[PDB]
Ligand binder design. Structure first.
Ligand SMILES: CC(=O)N[C@@H]1[C@@H](O)[C@H](O)[C@@H](CO)O[C@@H]1O
Ligand SMILES: CC(=O)N[C@@H]1[C@@H](O)[C@H](O)[C@@H](CO)O[C@@H]1O
Ligand SMILES: CC(=O)N[C@@H]1[C@@H](O)[C@H](O)[C@@H](CO)O[C@@H]1O
Ligand SMILES: CC(=O)N[C@@H]1[C@@H](O)[C@H](O)[C@@H](CO)O[C@@H]1O
Ligand SMILES: CC(=O)N[C@@H]1[C@@H](O)[C@H](O)[C@@H](CO)O[C@@H]1O
Ligand SMILES: CC(=O)N[C@@H]1[C@@H](O)[C@H](O)[C@@H](CO)O[C@@H]1O
Ligand SMILES: CC(=O)N[C@@H]1[C@@H](O)[C@H](O)[C@@H](CO)O[C@@H]1O
Ligand SMILES: CC(=O)N[C@@H]1[C@@H](O)[C@H](O)[C@@H](CO)O[C@@H]1O
Ligand SMILES: CC(=O)N[C@@H]1[C@@H](O)[C@H](O)[C@@H](CO)O[C@@H]1O
Ligand SMILES: CC(=O)N[C@@H]1[C@@H](O)[C@H](O)[C@@H](CO)O[C@@H]1O
Ligand SMILES: CC(=O)N[C@@H]1[C@@H](O)[C@H](O)[C@@H](CO)O[C@@H]1O
Ligand SMILES: CC(=O)N[C@@H]1[C@@H](O)[C@H](O)[C@@H](CO)O[C@@H]1O
Ligand SMILES: CC(=O)N[C@@H]1[C@@H](O)[C@H](O)[C@@H](CO)O[C@H]1O
Ligand SMILES: CC(=O)N[C@@H]1[C@@H](O)[C@H](O)[C@@H](CO)O[C@H]1O
Ligand SMILES: CC(=O)N[C@@H]1[C@@H](O)[C@H](O)[C@@H](CO)O[C@H]1O
Ligand SMILES: CC(=O)N[C@@H]1[C@@H](O)[C@H](O)[C@@H](CO)O[C@H]1O
Ligand SMILES: CC(=O)N[C@@H]1[C@@H](O)[C@H](O)[C@@H](CO)O[C@H]1O
Ligand SMILES: CC(=O)N[C@@H]1[C@@H](O)[C@H](O)[C@@H](CO)O[C@H]1O
Ligand SMILES: CC(=O)N[C@@H]1[C@@H](O)[C@H](O)[C@@H](CO)O[C@H]1O
Ligand SMILES: OC[C@H]1O[C@@H](O)[C@@H](O)[C@@H](O)[C@@H]1O
Ligand SMILES: OC[C@H]1O[C@@H](O)[C@@H](O)[C@@H](O)[C@@H]1O
Ligand SMILES: OC[C@H]1O[C@H](O)[C@@H](O)[C@@H](O)[C@@H]1O
Lengths: 318, 172, 172, 318, 172, 318
């Protein structure tokens, strides 16, 4: 007459190992993976405007090194430097290289407006062998090498107002001759001087002669500096020698633009998140590809795998 | 598990129940059957789903940041750039580990809890007509056919109708 | 709630209950009545207040620190300063999000538990004199006037004085 | 015959919504708030000593710009720099201005102690039409503009020991003429040199001549530096031209003093936690007013609202 | 405790028990006894032990880092070196504090659960032969000597053997 | 007739108070500490190769201060500088001292590889009474003080290729005369110069004459600089005065080396964790010893104690 009713849960053959507070190893019936641990080997050309630096460094593209003149006025949500880019122009040094690269990469543009700088008493557009724009001599497309004119180097002094409503990025630099004969010979004065100032800032440099390892045959070097001039402020360049004058300025903007060191080929797809290792899907809280990422991404975690249990404990039958 | 039903007083699960997480198995005059409890299985699912969603639908965008790999030795300033990124990574890895451990424990206990509600839901229906045999089975002390078993499964059963019969078989 | 009392085997809540978080509602030869269970209610409030205090009375000071907004573009150093403060914020916004999540989930289960605890405390008191109707109500199989109900609510109910009158009803 | 006892719980008319490990939305009977989102708007005047920089920046008060004389030796727990401060003295420039603003800010005092330096062979207290102190030409109160005297400028060389038990912060500077003529005219030597040292450190700065943009009519610029002398050490200033000498020191102290940039009015009340948007209540765990804080403040987080269920789950009632 | 057993319906613990966590105490024809439940005790211990190991055997290595003490005032750069270190410690000190809190709060409930699993394990065994007195003690309705008791404790108790004898005492 | 079976749990005489989510104080039957708060007061000699600087600073050692030659080429897992160390060789000053000390400490070695000098035209091995080497006037072991030879200081210019397979760490310096008479008298030129470049970098330093406070009787000073030459690159030293030349180079390796300032005695034991307080046990998850730490250790935390409950709730008995 009795009847028998038994309640029961389900169960499965292959369960999932999960950790819990009271168990670094237990077996449930189901879970998902939270640690995105794979890549696709490539960078999606979208949605982020990508720019392959190819053989050029953001810097060189900025200065105007011949083989990068293709990059002029480029924009980029993400500039991508490659391990094989090279510089093919006059030997240069940039104290605080890091910071220039960073503030340019972040502005994410290279619009360059040329201004009418007047250099009276000096010769312009000088060139060098180490910087062959074509088979003939040249220089950085954005810089003006200035040399003596009719046996003399004036106390250069030019003003250039910033009457616009945005900031201007002027980058210039000074020349460090290999020997005294080369100094006197190029600028006449046995000792040069460059002063670039505004109402807010002032940086003055003093060339320094000496011989340095040959690079594209040049023992001497050009040190590179930058100056930002705010709206309403004015730029004043004062120099009686060794000045590598400005030709204009770079428009500065504020955005989500940046740069990344990578060799991943750039393909055509959609990936909000980008890593040096290429694109990776943003559906998992965590990821184990590269601490280095760009865009909507999953926090990087030492752990290469974490399983979120999503089903009851799995208690099999025998 | 906190309610000790699953992997508890319920020796083990059924691999043959492919229609839900919870359900019934019976053996009355007309033979033996097996139905699943949707109300139950669903409730647990909905709960574990929402828990999941909270955890996966979230990521933060981070465009220009600080560098993290260096091609040359620098000192002070670089050591700092590293410690910052290394400290950061270690904090999240801890957040990530602790997250699943906590989430999982609560997942497993939530399933156990559900299982038990269905058992206590069931118990209160049967009243004085059945007894808890201890293996998760209720011994219905009266004749309960497939029409009867069903009435119970989705709570239409009426204890009064079979009380007298049951009591008679119980206290004899 | 892991215990399935509140928003479970107990259909609704009582907006009628003003003096407590949990209480009794009877119906006997004298009519109906209502009253909150002071020991139960206080039990959960005390627990929730303690929990709350663990989270409110604590803040630390910080005086000199690092700049957080800048007027001019600097570069490397400024990048780091912003990454550090941002990292800090993202991490902290995280614990804040989890805390409440955890705290609240436990807070509703606690409240559910304390309701269930009050039922068990009551079922155990009535012993063989009533039966669990499954909806949070007990059917006391014996005359139980206002006084008798009261004795149950302040836990002085003497199950012996009625066991016979009830045993009869229950099993007749 | 039988009775009926029913256990139940309360339920409110309008619950509050809260998130849980399995609900970003569920409803309880009550919740408190863990995120302070509002500010009184003003900075309460005293659990902390607040000093209002009015029209002066901590630097200009430190150097002694004429209209910042009111701040001579002021002390503070939190210095408030107003966005509309301005400089009305000689054109200057401070390399690492930020670090100097930071160490003075944390020192929390402008206690200036005048010592008896010995400037033999030069004219003292030079002044400029750019730093008018009254109808006349002044200069920074804590600085001494030394120029040539009776057709000469000695190889100035002075010594000031630190026979105290506390540290002395010396703030001196050097002058950058606008032309060679100004150089030889004020200092005679066609090239200046300033070397301020201790047994612990040295910093020798050389003037750089050239035209900078007119600022209050001045083309030149004063470059400012600083030096910390420890007890048992002595200061030694050696310069044969262009030295903007010190007049003493500022006693350095350690505390919880700092500085903040805000335009919020200061009022009379009692508030431990100050922010650029005004003081706020430190009775909550998380705040959302601003990441900038001074004092016992609530940890800042992004979300603007977080509810802590302080009540059971609200289940309506029919 | 969410399960209301320990520091709940069970008045208090037993200082007299020194060989285990949970156990029984009887008072049969032959006097009174006491014996700790190994199975249940071991379950508790094992779980909280793992819990423990998950927290103790883990520490990472760090070598060259950043200076954390300074002999002279520097400014911007240093302010950052402190602020970074300070923010790290505050975050960690927060993780620790919340970890013990959660953990403990759980260890306390886990134990209160395990107890309740034992109470329930027994109740079930005794079927209709005993009655929950409400204090964690069952009143067995039939002569139960040491051999009888023993059987319960190691779960081989044959509820039938005494059902009649028991049913009669209960309902008479 | 009947029997009574009761279920229970244990309790103890003296329990342990613990903090949970609903109590900052609640007794449990037992717990375990998680905050290592005590240290032996001594640093175990290993498994970490420890090196006690004794009275030498990792810099003084590197440079070769007489009483620090004992460290010539030492190696270390963890260099330990003492609060009593001192310097007694010529007065020096290193710009970005912190940085040098750092990069060396992490290299964990003083491997010095002397190389071929080429100082043709100058008097070598300059020495000072402020740096006695026995009865004689010495100088840093790794540095070569160059002066004039036969009334004349050549336009020194040497080349040193990096043909090995590891980065070389050269450290040189430039001397600052106390007076002009000293300048001319030592390098003949009235204005010296030192330029040490590579195909990758270039740093040119200019001497600065002036008087500084005596140090072991000397008013002059040596500013010290370093350069890292990369494999395939080459070093070049061009100077016509005031050069303090390099004798060779240090080999730079990468590992787990570092430095710590502690007065803790180095005893003979085995401890994985080292702190300025001596070694400590790493069996716990957190420590309150010191935030400064070397090796595998627990995370510093502000709390001096956190009890992790390992038993149920202890309930007395009236
Ligand atoms: C697709 C899905 O979500 N199911 C998961 C599977 O992905 C996972 O690999 C396994 C163990 O981790 O558990 C479940 O079967
Ligand atoms: C190199 C080149 O094509 N010049 C253009 C210039 O004519 C134009 O005015 C500017 C506007 O931003 O963009 C580019 O710089
Ligand atoms: C590494 C380096 O700069 N070497 C150059 C060499 O190339 C050149 O031929 C010579 C000029 O006569 O000067 C140096 O030796
Ligand atoms: C995720 C992956 O494929 N691993 C590599 C890692 O080995 C390498 O060191 C790094 C360099 O950028 O890129 C990736 O992180
Ligand atoms: C502590 C308490 O309230 N006890 C009362 C008792 O005084 C009263 O006689 C009985 C009948 O109403 O009810 C309760 O048992
Ligand atoms: C703890 C808290 O702040 N919440 C409030 C409490 O202050 C107040 O006493 C209560 C009234 O019943 O409403 C809420 O629970
Ligand atoms: C910005 C600037 O310095 N311009 C000044 C101008 O103000 C002044 O009237 C003139 C004096 O002769 O020199 C420069 O032109
Ligand atoms: C009492 C004592 O000697 N302890 C000191 C403490 O005063 C000081 O604030 C701290 C600096 O970080 O070092 C030590 O902990
Ligand atoms: C293995 C075990 O403990 N079983 C014993 C059984 O041997 C014994 O006959 C009975 C009487 O005390 O008690 C338990 O059932
Ligand atoms: C191992 C190494 O780098 N070689 C040098 C060795 O040439 C030299 O004689 C000694 C100096 O005292 O230091 C190191 O041993
Ligand atoms: C050569 C000379 O006259 N210089 C002195 C010098 O002796 C001394 O070290 C310093 C401190 O008194 O003052 C001057 O510099
Ligand atoms: C655990 C202990 O003894 N604390 C000391 C602290 O007082 C002391 O000031 C500091 C010095 O750096 O070392 C340790 O932190
Ligand atoms: C001596 C001299 O010529 N200086 C002028 C100066 O008037 C002006 O401040 C500046 C800006 O135009 O231009 C300089 O050339
Ligand atoms: C409400 C409901 O659908 N429950 C069904 C009932 O309608 C049906 O009459 C009976 C016969 O099978 O079985 C119950 O389980
Ligand atoms: C005590 C101190 O050093 N403070 C000086 C004080 O000597 C001087 O008499 C006073 C005159 O206003 O100015 C303060 O700066
Ligand atoms: C005295 C000493 O220890 N130094 C010698 C040194 O004479 C020799 O020229 C050098 C070359 O590497 O190697 C060391 O053995
Ligand atoms: C012109 C001169 O004499 N200087 C040479 C220089 O050409 C070369 O860069 C260097 C490298 O060996 O050697 C210098 O002595
Ligand atoms: C401040 C200082 O160092 N003074 C010394 C002093 O010992 C000596 O009396 C004097 C004689 O020239 O030389 C100075 O350099
Ligand atoms: C003295 C005591 O009873 N405390 C014990 C302790 O011996 C054991 O090693 C530790 C590990 O969890 O936990 C406690 O149970
Ligand atoms: O490449 C090395 C270099 O050696 C030099 O001596 C000259 O012959 C240069 O023309 C040549 O480029
Ligand atoms: O204010 C600007 C300034 O610029 C010049 O043109 C001078 O003539 C001054 O008279 C004039 O005041
Ligand atoms: O420290 C005192 C010091 O003062 C001067 O430099 C000279 O008189 C020295 O001979 C003497 O040693």
């Amino acid at each position: 007459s009795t009847a028998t009713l038994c309640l029961g849960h389900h169960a499965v053959p292959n369960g999932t190992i999960v950790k819990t507070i009271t168990d670094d190893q237990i077996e449930v019936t189901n879970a998902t993976e939270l640690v995105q641990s794979s890549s696709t080997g490539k960078i999606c050309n979208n949605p982020h405007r990508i720019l392959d630096g190819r053989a050029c460094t953001l810097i060189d593209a900025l200065l105007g090194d011949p083989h990068c003149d293709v990059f002029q006025n480029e924009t980029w949500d993400l500039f991508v430097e490659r391990s094989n880019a090279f510089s093919n122009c006059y030997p240069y040094d940039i104290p605080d290289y890091a910071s220039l690269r960073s503030l340019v990469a972040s502005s994410g543009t290279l619009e360059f407006i040329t201004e009418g700088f007047t250099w009276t008493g000096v010769t312009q557009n000088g060139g060098s062998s180490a910087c062959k724009r074509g088979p003939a001599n040249g220089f950085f497309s954005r810089l003006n090498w200035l040399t003596k004119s009719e046996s003399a180097y004036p106390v250069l002094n030019v003003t250039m107002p910033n009457n616009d409503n945005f900031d201007k990025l002027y980058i210039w630099g000074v020349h460090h001759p290999s020997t005294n004969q080369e100094q006197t010979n190029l600028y006449v004065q046995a000792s040069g001087r460059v002063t670039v100032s505004t109402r807010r800032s002032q940086q003055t440099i003093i060339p320094n002669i000496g011989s340095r390892p040959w690079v594209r045959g040049q023992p001497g070097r050009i040190s590179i500096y930058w100056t930002i001039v705010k709206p309403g402020d004015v730029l004043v360049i004062n120099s009686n020698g060794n000045l590598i004058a400005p030709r204009g300025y770079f428009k500065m903007r504020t955005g989500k633009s940046s740069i990344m060191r990578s060799d991943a080929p750039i393909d055509t797809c959609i990936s909000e998140c980008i890593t040096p290792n290429g694109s990776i899907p943003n559906d998992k809280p965590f990821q184990n590809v590269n601490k280095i990422t760009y865009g909507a991404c999953p926090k990087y975690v030492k752990q290469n795998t974490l399983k979120l249990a999503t089903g009851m404990r799995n208690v099999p039958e025998k | 598990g906190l309610f000790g039903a699953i992997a508890g007083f319920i020796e083990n699960g059924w691999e043959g129940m492919i229609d839900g997480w919870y359900g019934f198995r019976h053996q009355n005059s007309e033979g033996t059957g097996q139905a699943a409890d949707l109300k139950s299985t669903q409730a647990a699912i909905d709960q574990i789903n929402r828990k999941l969603n909270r955890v996966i639908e979230k990521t933060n965008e981070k465009f220009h940041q600080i560098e993290k790999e260096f091609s040359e030795v620098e000192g002070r300033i670089q050591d700092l750039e590293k410690y910052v990124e290394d400290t950061k990574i270690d904090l999240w890895s801890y957040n990530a580990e602790l997250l699943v451990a906590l989430e999982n424990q609560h997942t497993i206990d939530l399933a156990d809890s559900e299982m038990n509600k269905l058992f206590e839901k069931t118990r209160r229906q049967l009243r004085e007509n059945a007894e808890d045999m201890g293996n998760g089975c209720f011994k219905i002390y009266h004749k309960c056919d497939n029409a009867c078993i069903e009435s119970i499964r989705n709570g239409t059963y009426d204890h009064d109708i079979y009380r007298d019969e049951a009591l008679n078989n119980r206290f004899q």
